[PDB]
Swiss-Prot record, chain A:
Enzyme class, spelled out: ligase
Organism from which the protein derives: Salmonella typhimurium (strain LT2 / SGSC1412 / ATCC 700720)
Catalytic function, reaction form: 2 D-alanine + ATP = D-alanyl-D-alanine + ADP + phosphate + H(+)
Name listed for the protein in its UniProt record: D-alanine--D-alanine ligase A
UniProt-annotated location(s): Cytoplasm
Chief site of localization: cytoplasm
Lineage: Bacteria, Pseudomonadati, Pseudomonadota, Gammaproteobacteria, Enterobacterales
UniProt entry keywords in alphabetical sequence: ATP-binding, Cell shape, Cell wall biogenesis/degradation, Cytoplasm, Ligase, Magnesium, Manganese, Metal-binding, Nucleotide-binding, Peptidoglycan synthesis
Amino acid sequence: AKLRVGIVFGGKSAEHEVSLQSAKNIVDAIDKTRFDVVLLGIDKAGQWHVNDAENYLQNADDPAHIALRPSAISLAQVPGKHQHQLINAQNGQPLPTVDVIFPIVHGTLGEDGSLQGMLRVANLPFVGSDVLSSAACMDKDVAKRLLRDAGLNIAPFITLTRTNRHAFSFAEVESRLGLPLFVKPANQGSSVGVSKVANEAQYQQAVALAFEFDHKVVVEQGIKGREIECAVLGNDNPQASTCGEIVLNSEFYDTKYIDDNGAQVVVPAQIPSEVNDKIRAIAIQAYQTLGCAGMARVDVFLTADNEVVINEINTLPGFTNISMYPKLWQASGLGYTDLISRLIELALERHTANNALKTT
Amino acid sequence: MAKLRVGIVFGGKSAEHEVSLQSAKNIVDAIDKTRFDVVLLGIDKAGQWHVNDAENYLQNADDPAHIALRPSAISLAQVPGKHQHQLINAQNGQPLPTVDVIFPIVHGTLGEDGSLQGMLRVANLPFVGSDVLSSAACMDKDVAKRLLRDAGLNIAPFITLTRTNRHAFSFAEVESRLGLPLFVKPANQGSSVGVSKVANEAQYQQAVALAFEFDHKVVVEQGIKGREIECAVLGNDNPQASTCGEIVLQVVVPAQIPSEVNDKIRAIAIQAYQTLGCAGMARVDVFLTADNEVVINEINTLPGFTNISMYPKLWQASGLGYTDLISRLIELALERHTANNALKTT
Ligand SMILES: Nc1ncnc2c1ncn2[C@@H]1O[C@H](COP(=O)(O)OP(=O)(O)O)[C@@H](O)[C@H]1O
Ligand SMILES: Nc1ncnc2c1ncn2[C@@H]1O[C@H](COP(=O)(O)OP(=O)(O)O)[C@@H](O)[C@H]1O
C-alpha cells in the first residue's frame, strides 16, 4: 500500500550538483507515511544506478564538492512493459516496480523532453511536463515564438541559425533591437553562453561563443526591470503561487553548483499585491501556452511602468530546501512535504488520463 | 572490413502498426546491402521491442491486411548512458552488437512524436529524421499551426478545444468564426484517425466527443477548398524539395500544375520545414486554392515509406531512387549526429 517513488537525479548536465541537492531535500521532505523512495542516480556519464539511502552522496554539505557515490548496479529500461520496467543492466534482474518517477535532473537530458520520452516508452508515470512542453520550454527560440503568437509580452529578438548567421549586420541587429542586446544559445541553461552586448566587437564575440553551444542563437533586446518569478502548480487547473524576486548583478558559470547561481532571492517579492496578481495571471497564461504539466517556474521582467515581459519558463526548477519554486509555495500556504505529494498526485492523475485514451 | 549496422525500428503500439510493417519490409527489401547490414528491431503491438530475423520476421507478408510481426523470443531493453551495446537482452543482460544508426519508421504515437527520439538521444544512437522537439511539434497540429502562423505561412483558421474550454463554444459560435464545413481532429494522431467533417450541430458534438477519445486537445478548422498537393523535403541545413504530387477524387505524380506553382509550393514546403526545425525528411501536405494560394495542412516527419508511398514516389519522379533515398537519409543522420557532438558542453 505505499507507492514507490523513483527520484531521478544527477545527470550529465552541468547542473548535476544542484540536482544532487534538489534530490537530497526531496528525500528528506517526502511523506514517508505514503511513499517509499528509491534513489535513481544518474552519473556524470549518464548511466543510471539504484543508490542506497544512507550512502548516495559523498559531500552532502558542500556544494562545490558534493558527489554521487559510485555504484555496482547499472540500470536498463524495458520498453512497453507495465511492471518491472527497470532492470539490472548486467544480468536482467528486475527492480521492484516503481509506481511514479520524480525527475529532478535540471538541464540537458532531464528537462528537454528526452527523459520524458524514455519514461513514456516505459509506461512510467512521472512528475512534471511531458515531451513537447519540456522540449519547447528548453528551446528559447520556440518558446518565445509560441508566446508571441499567444499575444504575450516577450523581449523583441531574432534567431540566428547556421544558414542565416551572416544575413545580419551588427548595424542591422542594432537598428532592429536597440542596445544593449543579450545573446544566448537557444538551448542552454544557467546563463552559460549568455553575454550582454553594447557594441559590434562584443556582438561578434557574443555570437561565436553562443554557436559553440547550439546551432541556434537568440539575440534579444535588453529589458530594464526587476526579475520576478512565480511558481505554477497543476495539470488542467493551474494555480500560481505568490511571486518572488531574484537579483542578478553583472559582477561575476563560476557558481553553477549553487541553485540560482547564488543570486539574492527574496520571497515574497516586495511588490504591490495588484502587481503580484498581474504577474500571477500572466504566469498561468504562459504555462498554458507552453502546454506545461505538473509544475513550472515562470521568470519575468517587471519594468518601471509595471509592464511584464516573460523571460523563461523552467519545467524542472531547482528544488532544494531554499530554492525559489518550493519557497514560493511555502510562502503561499503549501509546505514542502505537501507540495511533493501534490506533484505525485498530479503525475498519477495525468497518467490515468493518458492511459484511458484510445489508440485505434 | 565491416559495414555499418542499421537498426530499423518498426511496428509499434499504434493505429499505423501495419503500415509500419510495410514501410519496413520495403526498406529492408531496398537498402543497399553492400553498404549496410540490417538489424530488425520490431515493436509488437504491446510496445515491446524484439530482435527479429530478416528471413522470417513477418507473417502474411504478402497480404496488406493480416500482415503481422512474427512473435520473437528475445525481448529488448535499452541502457542509458552507454555509447556502445546500448541494446541488451531484457531477460539476461546480453548485449546486441552495437548498432551504428537507427532508421525509425514507427508512424504515429510513440515513434513519430518525439518519445522514441528522446530514447535514442539518451542512448547516444544516431538516427534518421527529425529530433525530439521537431517531431513532437509536427505531431501536435495545434502547435505546428501556431508556429506556421507565427512564421507568416497560411494555415486553416482554427480553434483549439481543451477539456476545460470545450463547452465555451457553441456550434453557432464556432460557425460564425470559421464558416462551414468544419474539420474536427484530435491534435495528436496519425492518418485520419479521429477526424470528421462537420456540417451541422449534431455532427459537431459527435465529432468533438470522438476526437477527445484520442487526445486531450482537439483542433476545429475551417474547411479549405482546393487541390491536395504534397511535396517531399530531404536534408538537414540546406534542404531540397521534390517535385509535387496530387491526391485526387488516386495519386498523380507529378502533379499537373504550372511550374511556377510547383516552385511556389516547393519553396513554402522548405519554409515550413525550417520553421518546424525538421531534419532528414518530411512530407508537407498543402491545399492549393482556386487563386493559387497555398494553405499548409500537415507536416509529416515519418511519412509512409513503402516503395509505393507518396514520399518515395516524389523523389523517384524527381530523379532519386528508393535505395539511394535510403542511403542519403542514413548519411544525413550521421552528419547530424557528428555536428551535434561537436557542440561544447562547457
Ligand atoms: N532581454 C534581456 N534583458 C535584460 N536582461 C536579460 C535579458 N536576457 C537575459 N537577461 C539576463 O541574463 C540572465 C540569464 O538569461 P536567461 O535567458 O534567463 O538564461 P538562462 O536560461 O541561462 O537562465 C537573466 O536572468 C537576466 O538577468
Ligand atoms: N481544414 C481542411 N479543409 C479541407 N479538407 C480537410 C481539412 N482538414 C482535413 N481535410 C481532409 O481530411 C483529410 C485527413 O485530415 P488530415 O489533417 O490529413 O489527418 P491526418 O493528419 O490524420 O492524415 C485530409 O487529407 C483532407 O483530405
